[PDB]
Design a protein around this ligand. Structure first.
Ligand SMILES: CC(C)[C@@H](NC(=O)[C@H](CS)NC(=O)CCC[C@H](N)C(=O)O)C(=O)O
Ligand SMILES: [Fe+3]
Length: 328
């Protein structure tokens, strides 16, 4: 199995006003997006040591009682309003992964999308402050820290495609973004439950099967344990780990609006028996956000693809992904 070319891109110019330096970053983003589809963002300014530490404290200290109280509807019939946000339980002996998902902290009962009961909008659920002091504060802060990095990355993608730098970012707003953070624990288990290991067609043992991401872009921090593979025409290639950088890829909404010029890379998660974290931030726009599709290959950029509302895209995509790769 070969190793994927995943460049490390210094994204710091995207926070500045040196326009030529931003263009040189955008060229590297373009090149990566047309190759394997992945790159590492380095010099990003986020304290990822604190993120990993606080996440570890939470996963290791939460109890079965608390997990039921926080569980999404798939695990607790009482929580009919929690489809996205909450705890995703492991099943001892059957399912190893567990995770906690939270959404825009601005989604409160006062928010009009919550008042209207618009699909995909939910109010976050949190553990008791006294049992997990500082966790909610850290998690909400982190949402806005990674929001800020993601805004900057969206400027790079816009420039890469020959658009003005706010082309995507103007639709990525703190008041309505459907973006999510997922705090995923992959445990060390001995013996490891065979039910939690899938066998790929090529024989590889997997924790999560091939998929395209449901996102505009995905902004991922992982601990330093190699696990990801990307599909190329010549087969799957290993993505090397880097626990100081963020791993970035496009989701299927980017592929739609660029007429597959920037594809959403197909990728999968190898089984590795090691305690590790996987902390994605899924960059989603607003429920009514629409970007007119275009084709960067054409002189006039004309595309015959229908504009797709981001909310309808996200509702369909989240359900499709559960149906194909299983309830996480
Ligand atoms: C990370 N994979 C994942 O998290 C997989 C594939 S990208 N993603 C999902 O299941 C979608 C989670 C969406 C989230 N609940 C939400 O409400 O937006 C891994 O390492 O498995
Ligand atoms: Fe993915």
């Amino acid at each position: 199995v070969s190793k994927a070319n995943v460049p490390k891109i210094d994204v710091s110019p995207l926070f500045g006003d040196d326009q030529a330096a931003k263009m040189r970053v955008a060229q590297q983003i373009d090149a990566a997006s047309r190759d394997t589809g992945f790159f590492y963002a380095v010099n990003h300014g986020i304290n990822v040591q604190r993120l990993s530490q606080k996440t570890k404290e939470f996963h290791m200290s939460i109890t079965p009682e608390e997990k039921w109280d926080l569980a999404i509807r798939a695990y607790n019939k009482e929580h009919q309003d929690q489809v996205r946000a909450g705890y995703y339980l492991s099943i001892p002996g059957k399912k190893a992964v567990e995770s906690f998902c939270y959404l825009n902290p601005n989604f409160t009962p006062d928010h009009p999308r919550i008042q209207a009961k618009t699909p995909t909008h939910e109010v976050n659920v949190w553990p008791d402050e006294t049992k997990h002091p500082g966790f909610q504060d850290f998690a909400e802060q982190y949402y806005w820290d990674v929001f800020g990095l993601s805004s900057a990355l969206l400027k790079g993608y816009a420039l890469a495609l020959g658009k003005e730098e706010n082309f995507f970012a103007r639709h990525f707003k703190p008041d309505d973004t459907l973006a999510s953070v997922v705090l995923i624990r992959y445990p060390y288990l001995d013996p490891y439950p065979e039910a939690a290991i899938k066998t790929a067609a090529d024989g590889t043992k997997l924790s999560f099967e091939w998929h395209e991401d449901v996102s505009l872009i995905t902004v991922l921090y992982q601990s330093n344990v190699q696990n990801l593979q990307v599909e190329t025409a010549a087969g799957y290639q290993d993505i090397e780990a880097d626990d100081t950088g963020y791993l970035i890829n496009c989701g299927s909404y980017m592929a739609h609006l660029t007429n597959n010029y920037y594809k959403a890379p197909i990728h999968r998660v190898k089984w590795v028996n090691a305690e590790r974290q996987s902390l994605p931030f899924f960059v989603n726009l607003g429920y009514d956000s629409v970007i007119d599709p275009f084709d960067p290959r054409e002189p006039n950029g004309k595309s015959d693809r229908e504009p797709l509302s981001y909310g309808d895209y996200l509702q369909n995509g989240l359900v499709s992904l559960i149906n194909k790769n299983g309830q996480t």
